[PDB]
Design a protein around this ligand. Structure first.
Ligand SMILES: [Zn+2]
Ligand SMILES: [Zn+2]
Ligand SMILES: [Zn+2]
Lengths: 86, 83
């Protein structure tokens, strides 16, 4: 039965990294699953529908790298992308 | 306030409720300026369904009552079994 000692830390720090990043029009959803004393994180961000895929790959990747690097007790991070029409 | 406020307050309500052995997961979807909240709690596998309904329901009522900017709070349950 997973110890979620850090759910609150992780969710808040991740959300703040994501919401404020380049070309993110908002966070669609965020999910935290407890795994050991660490957290499995799924985040979905809104981006412009007209953005080209290579740049949305970079946008999502930069957020994954940054969360992984900056937020403790995160065993893994998936960053999905939902197109919005602006 | 939206996501961060709501997620933390809900998690703390849920995690500390009496027949909850831990929080399995928590999900927040942004809907307007409010949050759609899905939260799954670990309970004992041998708890009878009517009581786990009450446990989950009390958490839903409490979050809804105490935590602002929350649309639909769904509280699921995953059985844990020591033995
Ligand atoms: Zn995932
Ligand atoms: Zn739901
Ligand atoms: Zn509202």
């Amino acid at each position: 039965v997973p110890r979620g000692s850090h759910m609150n830390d992780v969710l808040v720090d991740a959300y703040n990294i994501a919401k404020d990043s380049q070309h993110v029009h908002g966070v669609h959803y965020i999910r935290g699953r407890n795994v050991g004393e660490d957290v499995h994180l799924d985040i979905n961000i809104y981006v412009d529908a007209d953005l080209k895929v290579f740049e949305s790959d970079l946008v999502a990747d930069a957020i994954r790298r940054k969360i992984e690097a900056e937020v403790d007790h995160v065993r893994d991070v998936h960053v999905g992308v939902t197109p919005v029409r602006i």
